[PDB]
Design a binder for this molecule. Sequence first.
Ligand SMILES: C[C@H](CCC(=O)NCCC[N+](C)(C)CCCS(=O)(=O)[O-])[C@H]1CC[C@H]2[C@@H]3[C@H](O)C[C@@H]4C[C@H](O)CC[C@]4(C)[C@H]3C[C@H](O)[C@]12C
Ligand SMILES: C[C@H](CCC(=O)NCCC[N+](C)(C)CCCS(=O)(=O)[O-])[C@H]1CC[C@H]2[C@@H]3[C@H](O)C[C@@H]4C[C@H](O)CC[C@]4(C)[C@H]3C[C@H](O)[C@]12C
Lengths: 181, 181
Amino acid sequence: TIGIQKRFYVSIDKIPEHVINAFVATEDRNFWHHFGIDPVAIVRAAIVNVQGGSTITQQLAKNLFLTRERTLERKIKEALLAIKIERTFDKKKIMELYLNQIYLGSGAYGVEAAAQVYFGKHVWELSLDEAALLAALPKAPAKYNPFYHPERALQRRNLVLKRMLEEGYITPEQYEEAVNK
Amino acid sequence: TIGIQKRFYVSIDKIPEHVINAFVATEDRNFWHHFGIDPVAIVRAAIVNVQGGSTITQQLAKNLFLTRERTLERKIKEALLAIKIERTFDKKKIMELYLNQIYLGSGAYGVEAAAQVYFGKHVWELSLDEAALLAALPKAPAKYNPFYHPERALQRRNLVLKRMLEEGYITPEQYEEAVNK
Ligand SMILES: C[C@H](CCC(=O)NCCC[N+](C)(C)CCCS(=O)(=O)[O-])[C@H]1CC[C@H]2[C@@H]3[C@H](O)C[C@@H]4C[C@H](O)CC[C@]4(C)[C@H]3C[C@H](O)[C@]12C
Ligand SMILES: C[C@H](CCC(=O)NCCC[N+](C)(C)CCCS(=O)(=O)[O-])[C@H]1CC[C@H]2[C@@H]3[C@H](O)C[C@@H]4C[C@H](O)CC[C@]4(C)[C@H]3C[C@H](O)[C@]12C
């Protein structure tokens, strides 16, 4: 009806853990523990002879700005906003907001809209390999879109699955089966 | 445990309509229709020989800033943030976020925490006259706190009830009974 970004909203309790886990493992491994920004993650990423140091909270803050500028000043504003958001709402709520607003390509905002556009299903009906595919998109939706870059999409999906394996969110068995899907 | 502002969070479906209606009638009558800012409300308030022109969305944006400055520049940033928020999440979601973060005095953030501190009950167990009391607080929690300014508190509570009556959220009968509570 109105608001493409407001198409479908789904509560966190109806979002599969594989989905939540895929995004966390891929975009912000220490999400459940940091306070809006991850100093250690910024250092881990720094000392790399590719890695992003921003958190899920920071990605959310980034989209709360009407304009799109990547000036260092904007980066600071986004971080301060993330910090305040973290003091106001708990992790599950922040995760909920993030998952429902994230642009996942093909005009789909939020995991529910993405599930429909890419798999013709509801997010709660997604399999592990399908969840991993959605988590691969935030990096660059157009570059990894499965509709016209299925090669890169598949490659990044399996990378997400590997991240999930390393974080302990899925077992070796689940991993072997999913990367072959 | 941690985060005074994150004590209790309650979903919009568990918040009584009298509560939602009381806040809307008192703080932002056209909430369900504007786009983050209310031009007409700003004019209605302007032409007054007392009235606030900000929306619920703007009050939410105001609290997403780590610092507290009332410069015209901040006012603009808050409005732009409200506008983007409105394009990202629907009204019920914005209302939900607002109602859970609003400082209502006595260290209570959000209507649930307020219900407990002021009435020793859950927000969903509140009566009309109790809901109106919470909606009276945002204007200035310390000045209208029922614990030490019960006179002003009661006076503003009945004003909220009158606003609800005018907006058609409650009947004359309900009004007569509530103002006498
Ligand atoms: C805004 C910055 C930090 C953010 C930042 O500058 N981040 C740069 C990283 C850039 N990235 C690697 C993410 C880019 C990757 C590109 S990507 O596309 O992946 O996003 C600085 C300025 C304001 C500082 C806070 C205040 O003092 C208050 C308080 C003092 C305490 O003592 C420590 C805690 C706290 C909250 C301080 C934290 C941090 O000190 C802040 C947020
Ligand atoms: C930020 C301001 C508006 C807010 C403002 O300046 N508000 C002052 C009122 C102060 N109050 C009475 C609330 C104080 C009360 C004290 S209280 O304590 O009660 O809060 C200006 C600057 C940027 C402008 C937008 C952009 O152009 C984009 C777009 C153009 C379209 O053409 C019309 C729609 C839109 C969204 C424009 C709307 C509005 O034009 C904006 C937000």
